[PDB]
Amino acid sequence: PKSMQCKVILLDGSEYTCDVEKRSRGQVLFDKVCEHLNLLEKDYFGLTYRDAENQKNWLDPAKEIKKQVRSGAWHFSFNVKFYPPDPAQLSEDITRYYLCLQLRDDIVSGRLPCSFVTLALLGSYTVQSELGDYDPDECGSDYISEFRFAPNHTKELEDKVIELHKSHRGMTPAEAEMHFLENAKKLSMYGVDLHHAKDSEGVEIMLGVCASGLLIYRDRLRINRFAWPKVLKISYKRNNFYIKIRPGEFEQFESTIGFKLPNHRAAKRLWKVCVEHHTFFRLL
Template identity: 25%
Template structure:
């Protein structure tokens, strides 16, 4: 099966996977190509179904109704603080996606000072590209209401360093890391700290205030404790079943990723069955036929960072040497022991008297008054004929 994977930069990779492959295998392949394997848990694959953008469930098979050639979008699914990201390649992909979200006004600075700082940092970073132009400068100046006559406040720094500081500034935005849902006049953002309702009435519901959530067909229901310490219910009727499931899944996965020490078994074990699987389960309850997992989160924020550090900074164990490697190592040691200790170039061929040590060549011997090994005064030296050693 041929899959096209589009990066935030617009570059398209074609990846071949088996007909029965799961989404995790596709993600692992593309992350290996990009050098992101150590931190692949931050990423996910999106696809378009109808007019909706949905996250591919990595624990299930790639959906057959996507066609023989499937198109996916590699995106950051779980955002974290920039200083917790260890790979430069991961930070670069995050930076590219941030630039796109700033252009589309999905991310908005908190105030005038924030606009000024982010404008300066982006110009410092983007001006290092050969495609930088006056038109791009004017675009960013208009977007952030700044003077297009840009003068950098800091001396030029490495591109990767500039990208890090852009991420650092954007991480201070209120809506950083939020996944937005526009549902019938309601705008909801699910982020690292909870649910933010933008319209019709702005309200913030932290994860600690949530009692329970449920999803049934197109209906999503959230029970929580409001600011007056009274239990309240948020009921949303979504446009489709997929939209309601996506809202329920996004909330549950983000709660576990940001707020829990480990992913709960109640989350990893949830699944549904299709009609064929339901009939088969009547006769055999443990059959995997038609089983589809609801959530695909495998690690929390702490676990991703910890496993990445272990993979990057744990010393690699010495592999057993082959016979040829062992012989080459021994030969190198023998050649080194027959090399002049002074010039480290020619072979030893001189014996000192009276100590009888042999450590130099005939050209270096006259320069020594004392033997370097035993510090005995050299009274005389003679040439010594040893077998020639060649590498």
């Protein structure tokens, strides 16, 4: 029984290595990673890989790993797939912990834009969780933390993290992680998966996929949003992605809205994430 070596980047940046049988479905690897992580609330998470065109793709747990990674390395990342809109309702602290690690990388990467004060507050909870109570011994007026907090670090931001960290004395890790999540969940790009597209006129937009629905980001002014209940069918054809919007009250006809994606693979990818997010949110 021939086995392939898998390397998984975990959310703390460490590498987990394991072997699966070469005809294994994605679920087999995912189960091994989740057992390694002592993660029970596995439904929110998934594995990604980097494809032939080097995009991020979700590893389909129901399909053979080899028919997905195809010519590529058996190298994966462990990620949040479905961002819980209310993380306080998760059953385990360890689930909230992994969601915090993902969100830290969402922030440092610039996928999750954040004001100065929110960056500092999120940072202060992370430090409280990781090091415990503020210690002046490990921080002079020139202190710079080992923690990555933001896409661009400043001395100002480091100072503000420390000032807020002082206020959290006696906060336990689970408590600080819950406060981190209570702030993060409110950010306008929380759990929003952004896809580059063009509208039916060739104008560059972004489509955002999230719990509440599909978002369009035309230009600063005019952000369209389609709550999942308003979406009856999602489809793709060639480089095009279509959503069938439910008929408004007293309207005779459903309405179809069309987008141009960079290529066929990008249209299929957007279709699949939309279908998955509609099902997820429908079972909330």
